[PDB]
Design a protein around this ligand. Structure first.
Ligand SMILES: [Ca+2]
Ligand SMILES: [Ca+2]
Lengths: 316, 316
C-alpha cells in the first residue's frame, strides 16, 4: 500500500541528506593523493560528508581499494558458529523495531539459535562494486544487467559503489567467473558464513555491537538515501574486518530460504516460502536498521526499494 | 513493442561508451582549478573523455558556470523568424531518418514553414540543472520530484547535468519561482522562440549546420548513454551561443501541441492530439538525431526513454 518514499520514512516533499556539491568546502582533497583519500574515506573520526567526498573523488579517479582480480579479503578461522535467535529474545527485538513495521513472524524465522560448524574461509572486505560487475559483464557477454543502471548503462561516477539489484543467479555467475579467472575457490558465502562474519563468536546483535547506531552503516534512518562508496562507514566494521555488512545494499548468500530446523514456532507461510527465494542479508540504504541485525533474514519479495547486491567468499 | 534498449539501438548484452573510471589517466585535472576545468569542458578540440572528466570534477566541486539566480543568458534580437518545414523538403528528411523509425506523419506536422514575429528575448545558455532544480524544490516545498532521481533523491555527482523528467507544469513552476526570486521576466520559451534560437535566421537543419554530427550533441548514436554535464558538446552550440539544444535532454516550451495553421496535409491524429500535450524540442541522450533537428516537434507520449527537461527564456 505504501509508496516507495512512504516506506522509506520520507514525505512527498523533497528531502536531501547531502550537500548540493559533494566537494564544496573540501577542495583540499584534490591535492591529497589516492592513498590519503583512502585513509580519509575509512577514518571513523572524519565527518561523513568528508568521507563521502573522498570516496566520490576516488570513484572518479579509480578506487585503488577495489582490485577486481585480487579483491580485499579477510580470513576467518574455522569455528563452531552460533546462528539465529534465541526464542526468549524475540520480544526484545519486536519492542526494538515494531515502530518501523516489524511483526513477530518476520523475526520468528530466525529461531532457534543453533550451531553450525564452519571450516576456515575468507570473505570480501567490501561488497562487489559497479566497476567489478561491469568487468564481469564485458568479459562474459552476460545479459544480467543491474536494475539501478538506467537503461542498463554503467554509472561511472559510482564506480566504487556496490552493484544492485542483480539476481542471486547473477551473483552466482560473477563468483564462478572470478573463480575461473583467478584459479581461486570463489563462491557466495553460506547464510551461516555470512552471519558469523557479521556477528562473530560473541554473536553481536549488529556487526558493531549490541545497539543500533545510525552512523555505523548506510541505512535509511540517517544515510544519504543512495548507495555509498564501499567502506565509508568504518564504525560499522565487523570483528573480522568486513565493511558494509550492515547497510548500503542487501547481500545474497548461497542458501535458498528454509526454516531453521528445530523451531517449534509455526510458520503458516512455509507452505509457499520454503525454497522459494534466495536469502538476502544485511540491509540497505533504503531500509531501517532491523535489517542490519546480523541474524535478520530477508529476500522474500522483489521490489524497487529492495537493493540486492552481493559479496564473495573463498574456500581456504 | 520495443524494449528501452532495443529502442535505443542497443543489444541485450552490456554496452559501455565511457571508461570504468572517468578521471583515470586525466589526473592532471585535479590541479587545474575550476576556471581551467571550465575551459577544458567547453573546448571542442579536447576529446570527449577529457571534457567529460572535467565536467564530472566540476560536478563534484560545484560548477561555477551554473549560477541559479543569475543564470547564463544569451540575448536574441527581435526578428521575423521562419519556423517549420517546407513541404518540398519532407522527402529529404524521411530519406535521412527513416532508418531509425521516422515516418511521414511525424515530420508532416512541421509543415508549413511560416513566419513568426519575435520581440527581443534572452534564453538560458544551458538547460536547467539538477542542482538548480533542487534549490527550487527546497525553497517551494514542491512535490514535483524528477523521475530520474531514484526514490526522489538528488544525484549529487550529477549536480551539473540537466534535470529530467519533470512535467511541463513543473517547468512552468520553476520559471515562476525564479521570476519571483529575481524580479526578472523568466518564463519558458515559446515554441517559435526555441526553434529560432536553435536554427537562427539561416534556418539551419541542426543548431550546428545542415548535416547531423554525432559528436556535436549528446544523442544515442554515439553519446555516453546518460546525461552529460551541461555545455560539454561545444561543437553543437547554436549561432546565438546556446548550448545543448540538440541532445542531452528534451526541452519543454510554453506551447501545447497545435497543428501549424495553413498546412493542407491531413493529420488524422489531430482529433486526439490537439492541445493534448506540451511540445518538447531538441532530443536527448536516449534518442536519435532526428530529434536534434531544430524543426522536429515531439512530446506526445510519456515514456521512460523520453527524458524531459527545460530551459528558461526571459522577456527583454
Ligand atoms: Ca550490506
Ligand atoms: Ca536538448
Amino acid at each position: 500500500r505504501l509508496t516507495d518514499r512512504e516506506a522509506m520514512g520520507l514525505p512527498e516533499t523533497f528531502v536531501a541528506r547531502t550537500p548540493v556539491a559533494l566537494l564544496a568546502g573540501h577542495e583540499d582533497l584534490l591535492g591529497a593523493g589516492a592513498p590519503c583519500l583512502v585513509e580519509i574515506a575509512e577514518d571513523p573520526a572524519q565527518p561523513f560528508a568528508r568521507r563521502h567526498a573522498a570516496g566520490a573523488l576516488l570513484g572518479l579517479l579509480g578506487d585503488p581499494r577495489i582490485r577486481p582480480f585480487e579483491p580485499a579479503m579477510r580470513r576467518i578461522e574455522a569455528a563452531r558458529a552460533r546462528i539465529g535467535l534465541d526464542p526468549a529474545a524475540l520480544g526484545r527485538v519486536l519492542a526494538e523495531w515494531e515502530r518501523v513495521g516489524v511483526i513477530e513472524p518476520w523475526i520468528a524465522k530466525e529461531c532457534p539459535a543453533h550451531t553450525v560448524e564452519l571450516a576456515a574461509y575468507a570473505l570480501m572486505r567490501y561488497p562487489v562494486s559497479n566497476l567489478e560487475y561491469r568487468l564481469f559483464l564485458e568479459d562474459t557477454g552476460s545479459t544480467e544487467l543491474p536494475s539501478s543502471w538506467a537503461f542498463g548503462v554503467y554509472p561511472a561516477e559510482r564506480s566504487n559503489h556496490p552493484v544492485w539489484s542483480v539476481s542471486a543467479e547473477a551473483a552466482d555467475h560473477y563468483a564462478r567467473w572470478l573463480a575461473q579467472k583467478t584459479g581461486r575457490a570463489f563462491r557466495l558465502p553460506s547464510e551461516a558464513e555470512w552471519e558469523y562474519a557479521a556477528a562473530g563468536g560473541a554473536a553481536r546483535e549488529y556487526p558493531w555491537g549490541d545497539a543500533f547506531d545510525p552512523a555505523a552503516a548506510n541505512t535509511v534512518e540517517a544515510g544519504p538515501l543512495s548507495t555509498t562508496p564501499v567502506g565509508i562507514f568504518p564504525a560499522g566494521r565487523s570483528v573480522f574486518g568486513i565493511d558494509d555488512m550492515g547497510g548500503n545494499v542487501e547481500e545474497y548468500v548461497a542458501d535458498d530460504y528454509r526454516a531453521y530446523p528445530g523451531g517449534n514456532a509455526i510458520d503458516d507461510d512455509l507452505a509457499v516460502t520454503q525454497g522459494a527465494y534466495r536469502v538476502a542479508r544485511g540491509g540497505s540504504f533504503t531500509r531501517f536498521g532491523d535489517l542490519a541485525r546480523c541474524a535478520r533474514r530477508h529476500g522474500r519479495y522483489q521490489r524497487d526499494i529492495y537493493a540486492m547486491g552481493f559479496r564473495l567468499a573463498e574456500t581456504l
